[PDB]
């Protein structure tokens, strides 16, 4: 019987549940400490050793064509090769490689090992002006309405800074700026001092025109540069909340069972909060509430929320897939 | 240590993940616009400059022997040479060449540059009668049951046109035909006017016997000829949905981890929809639902779905490969 | 500009992809049927018309010095000439020639036309005893450990036949022998009847000492002689699986991009299965699994897997080649 | 029909492939052992029986005018005759002859039989000083930039020996020298003892001014004299790698099909490695990497790489040749 029972199954009767995917425990370690954040000094000194076309091309392959690269080689380390990276060995142009690491769900990672989340965080923190000039937005930003918020940002943040607080909230951001100037580590001072000499252009305040473009490649946490600038980390929290809102709307739209509705939604604000508060900061929730009052409605009015397929078509095709797979084998049929 | 660590690795400890393939960013550009479709006027005037044996032989090497040509020289431009193409320089028969371009996953392409998808689209749109006469079906059509749908197409589409809609659906296709006769661009008018004078035989409606043979070489999108014929583009969407259904059944059949099940399935309907709606059309989903109700069951009953190897054999051989590769080097072992 | 653009290029800008090799469609036909196997009655009656020194010398030039002959004249027909072949025209010793045909990747072939795969199949099926006596193994057998499996074959197959099945598996092979004695064509009966009178020594069972030597010259499919002997065709499938295992290990060892890792591995078991099942047989997978359990480990322990060059040397030299070729012309630089 | 079919063709229809050259199996033996290297004791005692003008003149006809001699009489043994070689039979000056043997691709050779590769190896190992004095470089050395590496060799190797290793690498070569003084055969001791009494001047180390001139006549393997001198065999491997690099650049430059690009490149390092490791040595790859870091760039900067003919001219002429040959006969047209 092809759908009877597998070898090595330890129960003689067929279970009521169908079989599923195999969890590979080879790439997992146990002996790591429970809190092991990124180093962020080794990562910035590594990524500032390169020349910016290979960095922007790797950012393009991880953001705009990111789903294809994560579908092709996930669970392995990737070498990036370009003509612009050199190793001058007596005139021979030996290629220098960029190493990212695309981890699995079951995968212990090192402290300085660069995931694509860490890479997008570091590159979007270092070079926002080139991302602004090249209009390089990831598709996960493009579905929550990043483009309409970035059409007229120089007037948008000027109208936001002129609103009265509950004096305008420029004074509130200035008080936040003094509170962060008292409360910062020397590690971020080393990061700013190093990246200034590396040659990237810094950002002084949220009033800069290339300020929303720090979150254009959708980093997983706020970058170490533009951390103590008093109004940027809360703006990344605002965009993470918009991502979770879109995921809950898309999870509630789909007719289906309980576990796939639960599977379709995501927890981005929890991970953003954990990874941001781990860097020595306290997110003020009041500023996030100010952004939600300011442009929470226009973003949700400009979500994507596209119905991809006719539901009568999808139901019929998925039913036919399910009948065929339950005829052939004993696996759980995947979704169309 | 041969499996210790590579040179230029920037972390002193061995990572938990094995190394993988190198992504070459040399053939990628950034400064292209975000939407740059094909020209389709330059491509038709280029491919109608040739003589049909070199076109049908290149179609044979891209469809029937397509996997071997994409394995041999991928990431480069291919010259096709045949005796039938001339350049009469004072009697000297200088060979004229056909240029296709087989792109990589990391590769920006021009507007008029001919990929094999564009080539199969243009050739299958121009010359369906010779493909019908020579019985030239690609192996990706041969696994989703194209042959049994093309055995008796003249009676099949006659029984489909006689069914009552929810008057028969001939009136629905005629209303669709009037709606497309109002809504069409002058560019497709130029394509039809040019390809009529070039000498290829047109198709007037879906009732023609060489109508299913437009999708015999499996184009990536529906061709510019046979676009405004009201019932052909939805039939290509139906075949793309059949391809995605077969890929999901084959992905659910395989015992294995999550990422290789996700790697084995494909997204053909998304690309077909994007590339078809980019040409100035709106696919009516109702006609696709009509085709799925009509012959969705017979196609899935006639899928290939062949078990290629004994799974006990494949598991044993792949385990032995994995043990040997993990003994020798630090790369990720490929699948048998 | 020498690297600017070629004549006859139909696009004014330089493409991102470099140019590649020319595919010659002159030797390809379209009007062949989709399934056209070899005749195998004309081929055996042709190759038994000759005298065995010219056959063994042509087998030597196609197996042991086969890479040089396929590099020199590929895509053409080869005349083999020796003093031992005669045409007695009134005492004049006119030389008789052996015609093989080394086809290209783009090349339609006739039914009775002898490729080197067909030639190695026919010669290794007819004369295994002389190949055993002369120790004539091809280098593609020599890398998958054919010599250690052929050191002590008379004791090896005796220990395999004495193992208990899941009664020993001699009874299983005898049941397979009865099933093949019921199921065989008269064409193979004509082949055995003809080649017995031609003068070659037959093989009765797998217990013969010259039984592994049928696959010493590495045929592409199992020979028509020694087809219905119940245990030989599965042994050729076992050796084809060993070839694919070595090719996947060698493809996974090499640091490089995705398409050249995909290019380095081979699909030998698919072609062996297609060409063997086309001759009127059904390969029992259980016997192949028995061989993999029996001596799958010793063969993989005795693969060649030789690191040909220091990788630091190869990387440096290939980088220098790539820089020079990208300076000179617009072609894709070949591998060192 | 002159292009219809040949007599003795065994297939009634014309094949798609054109006919090619005849492989002559007369000069091939089968019963040789699989490893039969040169004797190198008989060859040195044979070539030291002569007087050096006939040796240098035969070296001139095999290196500098070598292509003409291999075009004229290939596949046969050559007698070399000069006035300087005697046979004193009671005062009569009977001429003594030098016998070389120019073998075919299909040709078994004896152990002591002198091919031109063996001859160039022995003569360039015995007499480097006269080759230095007469400036006798082969044209295959002249295209990979031997002259610029041999302009200032006494300062070049002095700057190489003074570089620090990873202490300078003189200590590394001295450690290699001690390792070879422990590991050498008595056969090479007999060769050095015999050739010292024959009258040729030995070489003590790589620091000698006539040290690069051992590889001026381009031997096929490193000579038996100057084998255990710790730094000379790796220098011959370096020059063989330069030959393979030039052949791959010239193979990638040519527009054409796949098999002639594959035909134009050569495998010299494989044959050099096989024939050198067969003499009882282990090539250290580190020294070859040191030479590639040292003067890999200057040699490739001084390759010949000459475009012999205008490609528009060559394409037109070759097309006209191909049309005429396909009109006349059924052979494959040769390249212009």
3-class SS letters over C36-72: CCCCCCHHHHHHCCCCHHHHHHHHHHHHCCHHHHHHH
- B16 and chain A in contact, CB less than 8 A: yes
Closest CA to A45 of A199, A198, A201: A198
Question: What is the chain C residue with the closest CA to D332?
Answer: C76
Which helix (H) or strand (E) covers residue C182, if one does?
A: helix C169-182
What span, in angstroms and rounded, lies between the C-alpha atoms of C188 and D191?
61
Print the SS3 string covering chain B: CCCCCCCCCCCCCCCCCCEEEEEECCCCCCCCCCCCCCCCCHHHHHHCCCCHHHHHHHHHHHHCCHHHHHHHCCCEEEEEECCCCCCEECCEECCCCEEEEECCCCCCCCCCCCCHHHHHHHHHHHCHHHHHHHCCCCHHHHCCCHHHHCCCHHHHHHHHHCCECCCEHHHHHHHHHHHHHHCCCHHHHHHHHHHHHHCCCCCCCCCCCCCHHHHCCCCCCCCCCCCCCCCCHHHHHHHHHHHHHHHHHHHHHCCCEHHHHHHHCCCHHHHHHHHHHCCCCCCCHHHHHHHHHHHHHHHHHCCCCCCCCCHHHHHHHHHHHHHHHHHHCCECCCCC
Neighboring chain A residues of C257 at a CB cutoff of 8 Å = 81
Question: What is the chain C residue with the closest CA to A77?
Answer: C255
What span, in angstroms and rounded, lies between the C-alpha atoms of B126 and B123?
5
The alpha-carbon gap from C333 to the nearest alpha carbon of chain B, in Å, equals 11
State whether A89 and D294 contact (CB < 8 Å). Answer: no
Would you say C211 and C229 are in contact if contact means Cβ atoms under 8 Å apart?
A: no
- C247 and chain D in contact, CB less than 8 A: no
State whether C61 and D23 contact (CB < 8 Å). Answer: yes
Neighboring chain A residues of B252 at a CB cutoff of 8 Å = 321, 325, 329, 331-334
C-alpha angle A34-A38-A43 in degrees, rounded to nearest 5 = 160
What span, in angstroms and rounded, lies between the C-alpha atoms of A20 and A259?
15
Would you say B81 and C24 are in contact if contact means Cβ atoms under 8 Å apart?
A: yes
Neighboring chain C residues of A95 at a CB cutoff of 8 Å = 319
State whether B269 and A309 contact (CB < 8 Å). Answer: yes
State whether B249 and A333 contact (CB < 8 Å). Answer: yes
Neighboring chain B residues of A19 at a CB cutoff of 8 Å = 255
What span, in angstroms and rounded, lies between the C-alpha atoms of C40 and C279?
10
SS3 C79: strand
Burial of D307 (0-12, 13-18, 19+ CB in 10 A): exposed
Partner chains of A (3+ C-beta pairs under 8 Å): B, C, D
- B332 and chain A in contact, CB less than 8 A: yes
The alpha-carbon gap from B162 to the nearest alpha carbon of chain C, in Å, equals 35
**For testing the chain B interface, which of C9, C10, C335 should be mutated: the one with the most B CBs within 10 Å?**
C10
First to last CA, chain D: 26
The pair of structure tokens assigned to D222 is 């490193």
What span, in angstroms and rounded, lies between the C-alpha atoms of C62 and C119?
9
State whether B303 and A313 contact (CB < 8 Å). Answer: no
Give the residue carrying structure tokens 């040397």: C313
C-alpha distances (whole Å) from B58 to each of B63, B65, B103, C292 are 9, 10, 17, 41
C-alpha angle A270-A274-A280 in degrees, rounded to nearest 5 = 150
* Other C-beta atoms lying within 10 Å of the C-beta of residue D178: 11
* Other C-beta atoms lying within 10 Å of the C-beta of residue D99: 12
Would you say D287 and D258 are in contact if contact means Cβ atoms under 8 Å apart?
A: no
State whether A91 and D297 contact (CB < 8 Å). Answer: yes
What span, in angstroms and rounded, lies between the C-alpha atoms of D122 and D201?
14
C-alpha angle C211-C216-C222 in degrees, rounded to nearest 5 = 70
**For testing the chain B interface, which of D16, D260, D316 should be mutated: the one with the most B CBs within 10 Å?**
D316
Option in C80, C103, C320 nearest D296 (CB): C320
Q: Which residues contact B189 (CB under 8 A, 6 or more apart)?
A: none
C-alpha angle C25-C31-C32 in degrees, rounded to nearest 5 = 95
Option in A73, A79, A92 nearest C316 (CB): A92
Q: Which residues contact A117 (CB under 8 A, 6 or more apart)?
A: A219, A220, A221
First to last CA, chain B: 26
What span, in angstroms and rounded, lies between the C-alpha atoms of B187 and B41?
8
What span, in angstroms and rounded, lies between the C-alpha atoms of C86 and C50?
9
First to last CA, chain A: 26
**B255 in the Ramachandran plot: left (φ > 0), alpha (ψ -120 to 50) or beta?**
beta
Would you say B198 and B48 are in contact if contact means Cβ atoms under 8 Å apart?
A: yes
The alpha-carbon gap from D56 to the nearest alpha carbon of chain B, in Å, equals 48
C-alpha angle D142-D146-D147 in degrees, rounded to nearest 5 = 90
State whether B94 and D315 contact (CB < 8 Å). Answer: yes
Neighboring chain A residues of D294 at a CB cutoff of 8 Å = 90
- B328 and chain A in contact, CB less than 8 A: no
Buried b (16+ CB within 10 A) or exposed e, A175-198: ebbeebeeeeeeebeebbeebeee
Option in C30, C244, C261 nearest B336 (CB): C244
- A89 and chain D in contact, CB less than 8 A: yes
**Rounded (10°) angle between helices B233-253 and B268-277:** 160
- D336 and chain B in contact, CB less than 8 A: no
Q: Which residues of chain D come before a gap where C and the next N are over 2.5 Å apart?
A: 166
Q: Which residues contact A296 (CB under 8 A, 6 or more apart)?
A: none
Burial of B89 (0-12, 13-18, 19+ CB in 10 A): exposed
State whether B105 and A68 contact (CB < 8 Å). Answer: yes
* Other C-beta atoms lying within 10 Å of the C-beta of residue C314: 17
Option in C257, C258, C316 nearest A94 (CB): C316
State whether D26 and C325 contact (CB < 8 Å). Answer: no
Would you say A77 and D281 are in contact if contact means Cβ atoms under 8 Å apart?
A: no
What span, in angstroms and rounded, lies between the C-alpha atoms of C96 and C84?
9
The pair of structure tokens assigned to C77 is 């027909």
C-alpha angle C321-C324-C329 in degrees, rounded to nearest 5 = 115
Long-range contacts, C284-287 (Cβ 8 Å, 24+): C284/C176, C284/C234, C285/B309, C285/B310, C285/B312, C285/B313, C286/B310, C287/C173, C287/C176, C287/C231, C287/C234
Q: What is the dihedral of CA A95, A100, A101, A102, to 10 degrees?
A: -120
CB half-sphere exposure, C143, CA atoms < 13 A: 16
Would you say C235 and C206 are in contact if contact means Cβ atoms under 8 Å apart?
A: yes
The pair of structure tokens assigned to C280 is 């009127």
What span, in angstroms and rounded, lies between the C-alpha atoms of D266 and D102?
19
Q: How many residues does chain C have?
A: 336
Would you say A97 and B5 are in contact if contact means Cβ atoms under 8 Å apart?
A: no
**For testing the chain A interface, which of C254, C323, C324 should be mutated: the one with the most A CBs within 10 Å?**
C323
Would you say B238 and B288 are in contact if contact means Cβ atoms under 8 Å apart?
A: yes
Instruction: Say if strands B98-102 and B19-24 run parallel, antiparallel, or are unpaired.
Output: unpaired
List the beta strands (DSSP E) in chain D: 19-24, 76-80, 88-89, 92-93, 98-102
State whether C112 and D10 contact (CB < 8 Å). Answer: yes
Would you say A37 and A279 are in contact if contact means Cβ atoms under 8 Å apart?
A: yes
The alpha-carbon gap from A93 to the nearest alpha carbon of chain D, in Å, equals 10
Quote the DSSP letter at residue D324: H
Closest CA to D305 of C12, B167, C328, A74: C328
Would you say C35 and C278 are in contact if contact means Cβ atoms under 8 Å apart?
A: yes
- A94 and chain D in contact, CB less than 8 A: no
Closest CA to B72 of C15, C246, C105: C105
**C168 in the Ramachandran plot: left (φ > 0), alpha (ψ -120 to 50) or beta?**
beta
The alpha-carbon gap from A99 to the nearest alpha carbon of chain C, in Å, equals 13
What span, in angstroms and rounded, lies between the C-alpha atoms of B296 and C311?
54
C-alpha distances (whole Å) from A195 to each of A45, A120, A122 are 8, 16, 11
Would you say C223 and C43 are in contact if contact means Cβ atoms under 8 Å apart?
A: no
What span, in angstroms and rounded, lies between the C-alpha atoms of A219 and A116?
9
What span, in angstroms and rounded, lies between the C-alpha atoms of C272 and C244?
11
Which helix (H) or strand (E) covers residue D181, if one does?
A: helix D169-182
What span, in angstroms and rounded, lies between the C-alpha atoms of B13 and B308?
40
What span, in angstroms and rounded, lies between the C-alpha atoms of D295 and D298?
5
SS3 D92: strand
Buried b (16+ CB within 10 A) or exposed e, D59-74: bebbbeebeebeeeee
What span, in angstroms and rounded, lies between the C-alpha atoms of C138 and C123?
13
- A91 and chain D in contact, CB less than 8 A: yes
The method recorded for this entry reads cryo-EM
Which helix (H) or strand (E) covers residue C99, if one does?
A: strand C98-102
Neighboring chain C residues of A53 at a CB cutoff of 8 Å = none
What span, in angstroms and rounded, lies between the C-alpha atoms of D99 and D115?
9
Option in C257, C258, C319 nearest A93 (CB): C319
What span, in angstroms and rounded, lies between the C-alpha atoms of A70 and A139?
14
Question: What is the chain D residue with the closest CA to C77?
Answer: D19
Instruction: Say if strands C76-81 and D19-24 run parallel, antiparallel, or are unpaired.
Output: parallel
Print the SS3 string covering chain A: CCCCCCCCCCCCCCCCCCECCECCCCCCCCCCCCCCCCCCCHHHHHHCCCCHHHHHHHHHHHHCCHHHHHHHCCCEEEEEECCCCCCEECCEECCCCEEEEECCCCCCCCCCCCCHHHHHHHHHHHCHHHHHHHCCCCHHHHCCCHHHHCCCHHHHHHHHHCCECCCEHHHHHHHHHHHHHHCCCHHHHHHHHHHHHHCCCCCCCCCCCCCHHHHCCCCCCCCCCCCCCCCCHHHHHHHHHHHHHHHHHHHHHCCCCHHHHHHHCCCHHHHHHHHHHCCCCCCCHHHHHHHHHHHHHHHHHCCCCCCCCCHHHHHHHHHHHHHHHHHHCCECCCCC
Give the residue carrying structure tokens 């055993």: C132
CB half-sphere exposure, C157, CA atoms < 13 A: 18
Closest CA to D51 of D126, D125, D106, D105: D126
Buried b (16+ CB within 10 A) or exposed e, D264-301: bbbebbeebbebbeebebebbbbbbbbbbbbbbbebbe
State whether C15 and B101 contact (CB < 8 Å). Answer: yes
* Dihedral sign computed on CA atoms, order A23, A26, A31, A35: negative
- C252 and chain A in contact, CB less than 8 A: no
Q: What is the distance of C-alpha B60 from the center of its chain?
A: 14
* Stretch 277-316 of chain A: residues touching chain B, C-beta under 8 Å: 308-310, 312-313, 316
Partner chains of C (3+ C-beta pairs under 8 Å): A, B, D
- Return the bridge partners of D90, or none: none
- D163 and chain A in contact, CB less than 8 A: no
Question: What is the chain B residue with the closest CA to C333?
Answer: B76
What span, in angstroms and rounded, lies between the C-alpha atoms of B306 and B58?
28
The alpha-carbon gap from D71 to the nearest alpha carbon of chain A, in Å, equals 38
The alpha-carbon gap from D127 to the nearest alpha carbon of chain C, in Å, equals 31
Quote the DSSP letter at residue D80: E
List helix spans (H) across D183-309. 186-198, 233-253, 258-264, 268-277, 285-301
Question: What is the chain C residue with the closest CA to B310?
Answer: C285
C-alpha distances (whole Å) from B73 to each of B104, B145, C22, D241 are 10, 29, 10, 25
Which helix (H) or strand (E) covers residue C268, if one does?
A: helix C268-277
């Amino acid at each position: 019987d092809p759908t009877g029972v597998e070898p090595g199954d330890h129960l003689k009767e067929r279970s009521m549940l169908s079989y599923g995917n195999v969890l590979d425990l080879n790439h997992l370690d146990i002996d790591e400490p429970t809190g092991q954040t990124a180093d962020w000094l080794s990562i910035i000194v590594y990524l500032t050793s390169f020349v910016v076309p290979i960095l922007l091309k790797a950012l393009y392959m991880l953001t705009t064509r990111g789903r294809q690269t994560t579908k092709d080689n996930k669970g392995t380390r990737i070498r990036f090769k370009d003509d612009s990276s050199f190793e001058d060995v007596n005139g021979i142009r030996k290629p220098k490689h960029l190493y990212v690491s695309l981890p699995n769900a079951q995968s212990s990672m090192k402290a300085e090992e660069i995931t694509p989340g860490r890479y997008r965080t570091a590159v979007c923190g270092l070079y926002p002006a080139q991302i602004k000039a090249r209009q390089m937005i990831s598709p996960v930003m493009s579905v929550i309405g990043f483009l309409a918020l970035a059409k007229d940002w120089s007037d948008r943040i000027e109208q936001w800074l002129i609103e009265p607080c509950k004096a305008t909230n420029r004074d509130y951001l200035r008080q936040r700026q003094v509170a962060l100037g008292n409360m910062e580590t020397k590690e971020s001072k080393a990061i700013r001092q190093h990246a200034e000499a590396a040659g990237c252009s810094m950002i002084e305040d949220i009033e800069s025109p290339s300020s929303i473009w720090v979150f254009a490649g959708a980093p997983d946490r706020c970058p170490p540069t533009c951390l103590f600038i008093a109004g940027i980390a809360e703006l990344g929290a605002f965009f993470s909340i918009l991502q979770d809102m879109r995921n809950t709307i898309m999870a509630s739209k789909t007719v289906g069972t309980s576990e796939e509705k639960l599977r379709k939604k995501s927890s981005f604000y929890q991970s953003y909060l954990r990874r941001t508060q781990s860097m020595g900061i306290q997110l003020g929730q009041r500023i996030i509430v100010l952004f939600m009052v300011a442009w929470g409605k226009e973003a949700v009015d400009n979500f994507h929320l596209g119905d991809d397929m006719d539901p009568e078509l999808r139901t019929l095709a998925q039913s036919l897939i399910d009948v065929k797979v339950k005829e052939i084998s004993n696996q759980e049929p995947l979704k169309l």
